[PDB]
Each structure stands twice: as structure tokens, then as C-alpha cells.
Amino acid sequence: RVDFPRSRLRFKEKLGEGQFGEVHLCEVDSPQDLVFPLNVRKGHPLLVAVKILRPDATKNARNDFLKEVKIMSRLKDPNIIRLLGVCVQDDPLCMITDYMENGDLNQFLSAHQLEDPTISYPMLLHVAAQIASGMRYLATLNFVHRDLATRNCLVGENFTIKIADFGMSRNLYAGDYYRVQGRAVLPIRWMAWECILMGKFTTASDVWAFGVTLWEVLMLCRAQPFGQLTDEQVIENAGEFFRDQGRQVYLSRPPACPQGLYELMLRCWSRESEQRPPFSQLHRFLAED
């Protein structure tokens, strides 16, 4: 219940610039003194990522950061960001996690093509299975992510995946969010129809977003969901799911995706939230395959 020693965090480079803070890549000085679940290979650099709140950030930003610490303090799964430690008794407030050396999954995967930098079909399924495993864990906690997408996943060594949540402000992904003055920013292309129409976010809407995330993976992250349709058309499509007159449209089957796997995606996009498969089944399907 004690702070990680802030003085042992040695800056190396900036990983991200946020509205109210920054994420740094740091080395941990003399880490064997602290093992704090640090995974140290003797005499090698222990690299960590540190999310830091600017000390002069607004009171509201500090309040939101303190709530994030509370949420993050519960998350203990190999496929979700895990806290190695925090520095919160004094400023700047910080949260420390393992460094994932290959960055976000969208940028990582889009450099690859399906093997004839390549990636095999079984490896794509292994990536997707890890995401499903992380979401399965969140579901056991009754924790709704609300923004699952490949841009919010991180890649480490050997295609290991962890689910994160960068928020909605990065310029690189601005086109993935729908902005209206005075409203929440919304990842409409990943959202179940009931999220769009009623603002109802649940584990079942996380399953829908998982279907879209799986589609992205099988597209090698080289296409945006519903990419030829306008934001207005995507919102209109949510209405068609509600109306249930056969005019709703779905993401198409990726070239890399067999029909059986596409049918799993379609189950994730069931109109009725209760008919969507649970993450325990999605993981089993993908891990067997």
C-alpha cells in the first residue's frame, strides 16, 4: 500500500502526450532492490511505461486520474494493463506498468500482410484469442470497457497483447470518433446499435465491439470499419438495427477470414444483446481454432 519509489524512475523517452499529462518510457534504477511485481532479467534494463498527471492539471483532471487509479488497482490479468506500482502520496501522480515494446496493435499489424513483414492466420487468431481472454476477465469484474478497438491494444514480444485505453484524443485516430458539441465523444463504428441510440453500454456491447476488433485484426488493421460509409450513415444503420426490417448492414467478410469465423462475428453483432456470445465462448472458439 506504499508508493513505488519515484526516484528510481529514470526517463528515457516520451511515449505519449495527453491533454492533462504524459506517458513516459522509463528505466528502473537498481530494480532487484524493489521486486512490486517487476520482471527483471538480471543485468538487463527493466523498462516501464509511466502515466503521469501534470501537477498543474485542473482539479477535474486530478479527480479523473484518482478514479482511474481506483479502477486500475483492480486489474490483474495477463492480457490487461496491470499496475506495477503507483506514486500518489505526492505529485506528480503516476501509474506504472510494463513496457510493451511494439506499441499499439493497429499500427503494429498494419505493417504486416497475411503470409502467402508477414503474419500467419494462426497468429492472427492467437492475437484475437488474447483480446478475448482479457475481455473475459473484465466481464468477471463487471467492468465495461466502452472503447475496445485495435488502437487500444498494445503489443509486446512474441505477439503478446494487452488491452489498454488511450482515450479518444490522439490525432492519429481522430477519424474513429464522432464529435458533437456538448456530447460525449463516441467510437460509433465500434458501437452496438443500442449504444448509439440509447447510450446503453454493457458487456454485451463490449462483445459487439470485440466482433469489430476481430474484423480489424482479420483485415490486418488496413481498413476502417464501415470505411466507405459516412458517420451519418453509420448512425442511420444503428436505427436500422432497431427497426429490424432487414435493412441493417454488417461489416463484410475479410479475405483472411473463413466463413465459420465470420459467423462468430455475426453472432457478436446480434440485434438482441442477450443473444451475443459470452467472452468465455469467444475465447474458447478462437483458442481451439
Ligand X SMILES: O=C(CN1C(=O)C2(CCN(C(=O)c3ccc4[nH]ncc4n3)CC2)c2c(Br)cccc21)NCC(F)(F)F
- Please answer whether residues 156 and 5 qualify as being in contact, where contact means their C-beta atoms are separated by less than 8 angstroms: no
Q: Does 9 bind ligand X (CB under 6 A)?
A: no
Query: Which of Cl ion, ligand X, none does 113 bind, CB closer than 5 to 8 A by kind?
Result: Cl ion
Q: Provide, rounded to whole angstroms, the least separation between the CB of residue 131 and Cl ion.
A: 15
Binding annotation: 15-23, 51
Binding annotation for ATP: 15-23, 51
One character per residue 189-218, x = contact with ligand X (rule: CB under 6 A): ------------------------------
CA-CA distance, 169 to 252, in Å (whole number)? Answer: 28
Near ligand X in 47-76, by CB under 6 A: 49, 51, 72, 75
Query: Which of Cl ion, ligand X, none does 97 bind, CB closer than 5 to 8 A by kind?
Result: ligand X
Q: Provide, rounded to whole angstroms, the least separation between the CB of residue 23 and Cl ion.
A: 11
Q: Does 99 bind ligand X (CB under 6 A)?
A: yes
Of the pair 19, 118, the CB lying nearest ligand X is at 19
Three-state secondary structure readout of the chain: CCCCCHHHEEEEEEEEECCCEEEEEEEECCHHHCCCCCCCCCCCCCEEEEEEECCCCCHHHHHHHHHHHHHHCCCCCCCECCCCEEECCCCCCEEEEECCCCCEHHHHHHCCEECCCEECHHHHHHHHHHHHHHHHHHHHCCCCCCCCCHHHEEECHHHCEEECCCCCCCHHHHHHCECCCCCCCECHHHCCHHHHHHCCCCHHHHHHHHHHHHHHHHCCCCCCCCCCCCHHHHHHHHHHHHHCCCCCCCCCCCCCCCHHHHHHHHHHCCCCHHHCCCHHHHHHHHHHC
Near Cl ion in 114-143, by CB under 5 A: 114, 119-120, 123
Query: Which of Cl ion, ligand X, none does 144 bind, CB closer than 5 to 8 A by kind?
Result: none
Q: Does 80 bind ligand X (CB under 6 A)?
A: yes
Q: Provide, rounded to whole angstroms, the least separation between the CB of residue 143 and ligand X.
A: 7
Q: Burial level of 9, CB count in 10 A (0-12/13-18/19+)?
A: buried
Query: Which of ligand X, Cl ion, none does 23 bind, CB closer than 5 to 8 A by kind?
Result: ligand X
Among 21, 31, 84, 97, which residue sits at the site for ligand X (rule: CB under 6 A)?
97
Q: Provide, rounded to whole angstroms, the least separation between the CB of residue 271 and ligand X.
A: 27
Of the pair 34, 144, the CB lying nearest ligand X is at 144
Q: Is 29 a catalytic residue?
A: no
Residues found near ligand X in the complex (CB under 6 A): 15-16, 23, 49, 51, 72, 75, 80-81, 95, 97, 99-100, 103, 145, 154, 163-166
Active site residues: 147
